[PDB]
Unconditional design. Structure first.
Lengths: 703, 205, 82, 85
RNA sequence: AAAUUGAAGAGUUUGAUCAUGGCUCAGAUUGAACGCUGGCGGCAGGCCUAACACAUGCAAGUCGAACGGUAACAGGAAGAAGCUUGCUUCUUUGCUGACGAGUGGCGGACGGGUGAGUAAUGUCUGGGAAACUGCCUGAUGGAGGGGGAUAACUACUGGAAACGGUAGCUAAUACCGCAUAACGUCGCAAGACCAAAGAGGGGGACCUUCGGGCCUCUUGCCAUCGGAUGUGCCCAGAUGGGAUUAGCUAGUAGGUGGGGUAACGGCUCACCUAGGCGACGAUCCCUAGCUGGUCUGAGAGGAUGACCAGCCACACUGGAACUGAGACACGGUCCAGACUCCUACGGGAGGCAGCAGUGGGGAAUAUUGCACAAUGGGCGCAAGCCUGAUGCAGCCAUGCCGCGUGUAUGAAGAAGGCCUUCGGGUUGUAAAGUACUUUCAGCGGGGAGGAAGGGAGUAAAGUUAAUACCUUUGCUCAUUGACGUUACCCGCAGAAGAAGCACCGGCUAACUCCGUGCCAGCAGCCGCGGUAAUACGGAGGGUGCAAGCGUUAAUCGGAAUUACUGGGC
């Protein structure tokens, strides 16, 4: 039945900052597990993981791809373990892709660069891992690049991210002279071989260029893994060194609780270091049953609604980490079975969506490539064609299984732009595409606000929104140019009041009736009422027919409803009919509303209203070094501010800025803050602004 | 598929009694049955040839509780059949199961007979039929099922089935809850006001 | 191999086969040389469930026509002993 | 291919090789008889006809050609050799 | 016996009339679409356009009772693993069940698809002669004897794969000669010539080289004449429009001889004649699969060829063939093209108009489903295996049919609406209220039939030489249904969960008010609206149909308006 025992299952992720070596290392992995014949390189576009056309050209990974391998060991020490690796993007534009993937993975290998180490996306992913609480190990790649420091990078992790790291392999030699690594357990040096692409290596004599720090850090290591129990410590404090095996099992334990992180160093591009990390993925990372069970909600919660022992015997339960788009079936849902067995054709129940789904073609994957499999065991990551309702993060399970899994949380789109097919009428074709791609990214949203006719596309980043646009030109092909969102202006009287009036000679003898009103304008104030359509009924001269005395404010609503000044609605405006004229035979309503319409028109000009644009309450966090520049930029924009507040890990800025303003604020923020800031817009009360555009957009139609 | 509305509206639109009500109270005392149901019913629309044909056809449809589809079928058959088209049509209309139920009691109205047929409260020769259009065959017995027998409504309908022209083709048993269909009604065994030839020309127009 | 097989006419969930002597190539419902009686599988009534045409079946099987499994079973049942 | 109709492809090729062998041999014997008949030696042509006859009849038996084709060869050749004198 | 019994008009030219004449409406029908609305069941239906391009998954295998054999599982055999001479399981042995790959046989030409091509090489009807036909069936026989290979395999080897090399082999129902065969072929005759294959089951012997030999039966093999079947061929009639297509044709028409075909044939070659077709429409051009039938019609006729069935044709485009009884071959070969995919860059793979499905095009057409339980089909001694045939299920009011959405009662003829001559009327027994029922939906429980068979045991005979072993025909036994939470039946609760669409000037059934004022708008036709609009919009009311309604599109009718029936100058 089960090809590989659950204990011989590793589900790992490669998350790190941009260009940290995450994709290259997976290529070295696909090479040193024999699954791929050529090592490859990203700049050449050769990398398999980047299958997407954009990813090949830009070298960027714009999606997470999952692949598996069998690393028996570096010495064929173990029977082949199936390492499920989910390589992830590190571009903050695509942040769902790391988190969508992160909940599913059991362990994380977080890459770092020896020149830089912790860089901004690196903290971002660290935070993501902490929320899904993945036990982590680390690979510090680029140790073949000047500025390379294993030691310094370790400190960087401790100083910045917050993690306390235990060295596993120190480094033999400098950046150009990176011969290989020194284990702090085997006490060996795996000097790799240049002629072969790292395929062969030699365990060596631990030379004196580096034989002394090794002792210090080996000693520092024992102490920390020995920091797992007094049974180790009583012997450790017995002055005796505990066995490496007790250290390695102790190591696996400390990683599970996240007490320590294990740091491995190598150079994927230099084809060195990669084979050992794949070995240490076996050594400390968690197997599906090497930690406690998935938990659940049952029937609005229970004592232990789900304590699903990940097993080939427990009832089927899963999570759809990702929905992806395939043009021929129309979807591909990536699922990890937390507990259970599912087979081709098996029905599943969408615990979250309360529905029935049939799994038509379960497949396994090598990035883009897919291999159909009849059944999926627990702890296996697979892609399911034939599933049409599962949202990213929605549990798919057998009936009577947990309703809710922990992955119900996702980021908020930060950039908004609008789009138009060249052909004005390809708008639905364009529209459907935006929708499909919106299913795949819970972070790409398409809402065509009905205030204006514009199609609005919201996304986590400027690249994302562009990577999300070339996909439309390429798949679901449409040609579309992006632009600016429209303007949601409004208006209100300032203070002026009169006894204005309107009148048509509806009689003429033959016509037979007429209507006329004397009105009285006032504003309330910008934001005193919930009911912007304020009013007072007074009339006691020319008292219009009674059966529609109260029915003569709602017909007037259709002026406050939209557009008196420049095609923009009114707020807080108060109308007051006091006099008028009529005759109670049949005072025609549809031709009496002309009196009301000219009453509004004349009333508006005399009252000198104003125009108030949309302005919101922005809230920003940023490092306490970029305050001057972020506030200077807010100042360049028409922004007021709110809070003289400084956080402890930064500074919380509060600012009132326009809504037509701040187009592309996020990218400007990242630019001037070193991609280390977030923000939000609260849609606060509208405020007036002197604008050359408010009248040029109605003088566009002139009179 | 059933006219759920004011039956007396229909009746006084026809002017005549469609018997869409039980005999508990007179027709005038329940509805002002001389004027059309409208606010302009007091007025008089001068008749047209189509007018009287449609009105007779609708009278028959409203009497028997049949809709225009399946009434066109009751004409298609009895046009295919042999004999007089209109007579065969009236026979095919009296053969309906709610019809024979009504004419044998068990329901004071065709709609009560429809509910009787539909609620599996009837048994054409033991076999529970619940198709209100079941064209009952001669030499056949329709029997009320037990638990439908002795319900309050069936008894009242058996009692009220008198004061009415006794059908020359039924042989009810009134409490034993049997009732036969000894032979199909011929022409003269019915109201004789229904001019079936009008309907025939309506449908052959 | 001219067969004598059932032809599966009727309706959904209510079959009614027709014993047809047809070349074994043509489709079940398709072309046939001659029909020799019918067979109603679902009949549970006074009306005859099956009826064959034995003199012509014998003519065919003397000309070498193969008899299907159910048509053999129906010749059995037509005979009193079976 | 797709199915195991590739096996039939191999078998058809092999049978074509063999049939071409035998059909070439048979047609060569008939070429001999025709060259004799256009040479005029009724007795040499007769020997050639009696040499081809068992070949062509054996081939017809094998199925490489038809009984009718073998008989047609023999009839044509008898007619020719008889008018050959 | 019955197999029919069937034919309707109206509006509109006019100040009015009668004719002529067109337009329009009333009907029936649809693979429909759109709008609004939508409860259920049954049976059907479902890419009409791009024969446009196709990812993926299935759509053709089977036989160990032809053979060499042993890759996988199992049974055993020898154990000096495991061990308490083992129940606590080590390897070798095809030995046996069995079986991957391989040789071989049969199938793969069926079934499934689409209608591009095809105006006649096709189809339909009716005849005909110059033919072949696997499997199926009948009749008579044979079924001696022998050889050389060859895959699989071993070796070495090459390749990324696909897929190979190069020697050594190893069988056969694979191949080949011989012997033998005549109511078989050729030949007027004489005469000459042609085939084969064996496998399985048990057994009284009795013989061995535990190979078996031998006796049987069960199948299989070769030949010939038959049948059935299927197929090929010929003929006549009929089968579209255009003459704003009148000449066309040179293998062309025929004759002779050779060749070819299963078969006749310019089918073909070489001569020879100069014919042949054509106003009964040749030739060309456009269009088109044809038929039973479908719609319509009183008919005659008109339109059509979705479903279903018969024939034809095509398989990405063009060509050729090979194997074979059958093909010039959907899921075979080769080549040329365009296209797509794989590649380690050296090469390689493919053809959804099979079933689902995607894109696209379009007003518009469904699931990447479940079983082979039925019936068929291939293989097989069977068991069985395979079947996107087929049976079922899903989606969609797409159609037809059936049912429900309550029934009886109920005059303060309520309130409210609307009209009003201000009295009232209408909504309206309508509601509410009262009584009763619970179809269907929803829960819960029972539960046919599609299931025949097949298999194991049994007995009887037939069987032989033998109560074995095979049949065949009964008896018993356990059983086989995807649909399926089946149909249907029973109980539970309560009128709860279930009504909309169009219309109301005349044609045409069904009217008032208000607001509007030749505006906005309506209109199938006539026409409506410029101050009292039943023609627009709303409201109240009414009429028709109803889980549909209306609109658009399409066919016939009405239209005697292409008049053959059945018209006119
Ligand atoms: N010098 C050096 N370059 C490296 C190393 N690993 C990866 N790279 C290069 O870094 C660039 C981006 O690496 P990649 O793995 O695509 O980045 P990611 O996909 O963002 O992790 C590529 O050019 C790699 O060649 C290394 O160890 N040393
Ligand atoms: Mg780059
Ligand atoms: Mg990358
Ligand atoms: Mg209906
Ligand atoms: Mg299958
Ligand atoms: Mg085998
Ligand atoms: Mg079709
Ligand atoms: Mg040999
Ligand atoms: Mg042989
Ligand atoms: Mg000749
Ligand atoms: Mg013509
Ligand atoms: Mg065509
Ligand atoms: Mg006519
Ligand atoms: Mg195509
Ligand atoms: Mg051939
Ligand atoms: Mg084929
Ligand atoms: Mg195909
Ligand atoms: Mg379209
Ligand atoms: Mg079968
Ligand atoms: Mg009133
Ligand atoms: Mg029910
Ligand atoms: Mg049984
Ligand atoms: Mg059964
Ligand atoms: Mg009228
Ligand atoms: Mg209208
Ligand atoms: Mg119309
Ligand atoms: Mg008016
Ligand atoms: Mg005519
Ligand atoms: Mg005339």
């Amino acid at each position: 039945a089960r090809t590989t025992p659950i204990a011989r299952y590793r589900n790992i992720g490669i998350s790190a900052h941009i260009d940290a070596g995450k994709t290259t290392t997976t290529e070295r992995i696909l090479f040193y597990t024999g699954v791929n014949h050529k090592i490859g390189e990203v700049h050449d576009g050769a990398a398999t993981m980047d299958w997407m056309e954009q990813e090949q050209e830009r070298g960027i990974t714009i999606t997470s791809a999952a692949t598996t391998a069998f690393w028996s060991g570096m010495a064929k020490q173990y029977e082949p373990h199936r390492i499920n690796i989910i390589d992830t993007p590190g571009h903050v534009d695509f942040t769902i892709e790391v988190e969508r993937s992160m909940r599913v993975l059991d362990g994380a290998v977080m890459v770092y660069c020896a020149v830089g180490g912790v860089q901004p996306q690196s903290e971002t992913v660290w935070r993501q891992a902490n929320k899904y609480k993945v036990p982590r190990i680390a690979f510090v790649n680029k140790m073949d690049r000047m500025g390379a420091n294993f030691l310094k990078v370790v400190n960087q992790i401790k100083t910045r991210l917050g993690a306390n790291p235990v060295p596993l392999q120190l480094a033999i030699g400098a950046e150009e002279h990176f011969t290989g690594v020194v284990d702090l357990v085997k006490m060996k040096a795996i000097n790799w071989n240049d002629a072969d692409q790292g395929v062969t290596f030699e365990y060596e004599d631990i030379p004196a260029d580096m034989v002394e720090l090794a002792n210090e850090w080996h000693q520092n290591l024992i102490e920390s893994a020995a920091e797992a129990s007094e049974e180790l410590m009583e012997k450790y404090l017995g002055g005796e060194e505990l066995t490496e095996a007790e250290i390695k099992g102790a190591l696996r334990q400390r990683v599970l609780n996240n007490e320590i992180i294990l740091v491995t160093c190598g150079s994927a591009f230099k084809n060195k270091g990669v084979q050992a990390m794949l070995d240490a993925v076996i050594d400390y990372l968690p197997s599906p049953v090497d930690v406690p069970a998935i938990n659940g909600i049952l029937d609005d919660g229970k004592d232990t609604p789900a304590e699903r022992h990940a097993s080939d015997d427990e009832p089927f339960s899963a999570l759809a980490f990702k929905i992806a788009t395939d043009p021929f079936v129309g979807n591909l849902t990536f699922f990890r079975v937390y507990s259970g067995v599912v087979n081709s054709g098996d029905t599943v129940l969408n615990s979250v969506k309360a529905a029935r789904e049939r799994f038509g073609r379960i497949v396994q994957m090598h990035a883009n490539k897919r291999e159909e499999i009849k059944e999926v065991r627990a702890g296996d990551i697979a892609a399911a064609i034939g599933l049409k309702d599962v949202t990213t993060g929605d549990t798919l399970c057998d009936p009577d299984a947990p309703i809710i899994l922990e992955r119900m949380e996702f980021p908020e789109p930060v950039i908004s732009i609008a789009v138009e097919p060249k052909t004005k009428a390809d708008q639905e074709k364009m529209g459907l595409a935006l929708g499909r791609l919106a299913k795949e990214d819970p972070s790409f949203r398409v809402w065509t606000d009905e205030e204006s006719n514009q199609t609005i596309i919201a996304g986590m980043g400027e690249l994302h929104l562009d990577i999300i646009v070339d996909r439309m030109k390429r798949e679901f092909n449409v040609e579309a140019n992006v632009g600016k969102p429209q303007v949601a202006y409004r208006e209100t009287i300032r203070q002026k009041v009169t006894d204005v009036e309107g009148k048509h000679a509806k009689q003429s003898g033959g016509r037979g009736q007429y209507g006329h009103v004397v009105i009285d304008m006032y504003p309330l104030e910008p934001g005193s009422n919930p009911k912007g359509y304020e009013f007072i009924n007074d009339i006691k001269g020319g008292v219009i027919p009674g059966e529609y005395i109260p029915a003569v404010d709602k017909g007037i609503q259709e002026q406050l409803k939209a557009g008196p000044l420049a095609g923009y609605p009114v707020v807080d405006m108060g109308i007051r009919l006091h006099f008028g004229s009529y005759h109670d035979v049949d005072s025609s309503e549809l031709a009496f509303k002309l009196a009301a319409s000219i009453a509004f028109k004349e009333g508006f000009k005399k009252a000198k209203p104003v125009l108030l644009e949309p302005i919101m309450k922005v809230e920003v966090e940023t490092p306490e070094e970029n305050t001057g520049d972020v506030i200077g930029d807010l100042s360049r924009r028409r922004g007021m501010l709110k809070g003289q507040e400084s956080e402890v890990t930064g500074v919380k800025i509060h600012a009132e800025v326009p809504l037509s303003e701040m187009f592309g604020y996020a990218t400007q923020l990242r630019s001037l803050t070193k991609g280390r800031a977030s923000y939000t817009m609260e849609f606060l009360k509208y405020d007036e602004a002197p604008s050359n555009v408010a009248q040029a957009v109605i003088e566009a139609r002139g009179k | 598929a059933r006219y759920l509305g004011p039956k007396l509206k229909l009746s006084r639109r026809e002017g005549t009694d469609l018997f869409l009500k039980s005999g508990v109270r007179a027709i005038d005392t329940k509805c002002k049955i001389e004027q059309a149901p409208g606010q302009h019913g007091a007025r008089k629309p001068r008749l047209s040839d189509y007018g009287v044909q449609l009105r007779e056809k609708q009278k028959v449809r409203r009497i028997y509780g049949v809709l225009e589809r399946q009434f066109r079928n009751y004409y298609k058959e009895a046009a295919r059949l042999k004999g007089n088209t209109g007579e065969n049509l009236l026979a095919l209309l009296e053969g309906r199961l709610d019809n024979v139920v009504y004419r044998m009691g068990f329901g004071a109205t065709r709609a009560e007979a429809r509910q009787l047929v539909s609620h599996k409260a009837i048994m054409v020769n033991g076999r529970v039929v619940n198709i209100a259009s079941y064209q009952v065959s001669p030499n056949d017995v329709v029997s009320i099922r037990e638990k439908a027998k002795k319900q309050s409504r069936v008894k009242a309908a058996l009692e009220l089935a008198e004061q009415r022209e006794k059908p020359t083709w039924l042989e009810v048993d009134a409490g034993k809850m049997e009732g036969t269909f000894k032979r199909k009604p011929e022409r003269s065994d019915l109201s004789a006001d229904i001019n079936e030839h009008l309907i025939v020309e309506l449908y052959s127009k | 191999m001219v067969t004598i097989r059932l032809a599966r006419h009727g309706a959904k969930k209510r079959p009614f086969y027709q014993v047809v002597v047809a070349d074994s190539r043509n489709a079940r419902n398709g072309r046939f040389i001659e029909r020799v009686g019918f067979f109603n599988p679902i009949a549970s009534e006074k009306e005859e469930g099956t009826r064959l045409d034995l003199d012509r079946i014998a003519h065919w099987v003397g000309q070498g026509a193969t008899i299907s499994d159910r048509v053999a079973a129906l010749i059995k049942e037509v005979n009193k002993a079976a | 291919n797709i199915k195991s109709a590739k096996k039939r492809a191999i078998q058809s090729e092999k049978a074509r090789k063999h049939n071409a062998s035998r059909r070439s041999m048979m047609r060569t014997f008939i070429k001999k008889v025709y060259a004799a008949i256009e040479a005029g030696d009724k007795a040499a042509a007769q020997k050639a006809f009696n040499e081809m006859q068992p070949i062509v009849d054996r081939q017809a038996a094998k199925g490489l050609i038809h009984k009718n084709k073998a008989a047609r060869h023999k009839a044509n050749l008898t007619a020719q050799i008889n008018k050959l004198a």
